[PDB]
Amino acid sequence: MIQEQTMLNVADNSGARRVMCIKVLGGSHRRYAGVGDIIKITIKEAIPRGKVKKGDVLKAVVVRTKKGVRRPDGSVIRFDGNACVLLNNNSEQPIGTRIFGPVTRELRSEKFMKIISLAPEVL
């Protein structure tokens, strides 16, 4: 349940460590992004020699949330933190080559098959 100003951890090796959501995309007055949703981010902290730099503006897909996801039987999966995977602003494909920590079956789509492939675990 991510909104403007939300800080997120980074679940890839793109070089960013902390990013902030600056826009929830895909709708007028749209409040929240959940797992599988694409957000607009600014990089607030990044490791010295990564593929991305502090202050860059780009896109990310949310892959873990504290609020979590519901399943058709009514069960929920919650995570200890919020995390996203950085995406190239135009192609919206991952910038990093590795994906860290678990992700969820909600990302099983044409657009995010690469994340599923790279993730160590899909819940």
């Binding site: 399943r71 039987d73 009514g74």
Partner: protein, 209 residues
């Protein structure tokens, strides 16, 4: 198509084989007894009036008792009317049960919504609150302005303001029929319906379809 009068038993869930949980309202539809048939010649329109359930004898007044006796039908707890379609015919004293919905995919359910009493504009009309702080003087949930100035010099009719909320007729449209259980006089519909547990419900085949 006619409908049936039931009772909101409560909600539960149906687990399917593929791991879906369907939230369902359980509606007890006992046999609906036709107490009067209205036709164009005598009444100006085509309809049936039904009753269901039962009422204690000393709670039935002589007028209502005479009305039931003319139908040759035991007294139910109330009387409800359903308009008749062109191909629809019924007889006084006929019993109509929940198998009426055997092949119906979707239903409209009408009940009396729960009563919230005197509601403020925030609860009743989703008005936003003013500042909790920043100097606000006694005006945190209050409505704000209710009009203009000298023009028009009045409040418009239908202005959203505080008042009674709920305890009114509500219809929820095109709910999936999950199960019809003729033996147990039960209809299960997917999702919530108006009213509190135990209250009367009017169920009719969905008008939108």
């Amino acid at each position: 198509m006619i409908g049936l009068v039931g009772k909101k038993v409560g909600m539960t869930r149906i687990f399917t084989e593929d791991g879906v949980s369907i939230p369902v309202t359980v509606i007890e539809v006992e046999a609906n007894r036709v107490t009067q048939v209205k036709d164009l010649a005598n009444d100006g329109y085509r309809a049936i009036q039904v009753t269901t359930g039962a009422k204690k004898a000393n709670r039935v007044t002589k007028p209502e008792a005479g009305h039931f006796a003319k139908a040759g039908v035991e007294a139910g707890r109330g009387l409800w009317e359903f308009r008749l379609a062109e191909g629809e015919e019924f007889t006084v004293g006929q019993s109509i049960s929940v198998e009426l919905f055997a092949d119906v995919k979707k239903v409209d359910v009408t009940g009396t919504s729960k009563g919230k009493g005197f509601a403020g504009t925030v609860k009743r009309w989703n008005f936003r609150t003013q500042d909790a702080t920043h100097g606000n003087s006694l005006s945190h949930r209050v409505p704000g302005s209710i009009g203009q100035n000298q023009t028009p010099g009045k409040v418009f009719k239908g202005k959203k303001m505080a008042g009674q909320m709920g305890n009114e007729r509500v219809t929820v449209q095109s709910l999936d029929v999950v199960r019809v259980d003729a033996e147990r006089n039960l209809l299960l519909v997917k999702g919530a319906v108006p009213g509190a547990t135990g209250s009367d419900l009017i169920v009719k085949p969905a008008v939108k379809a």
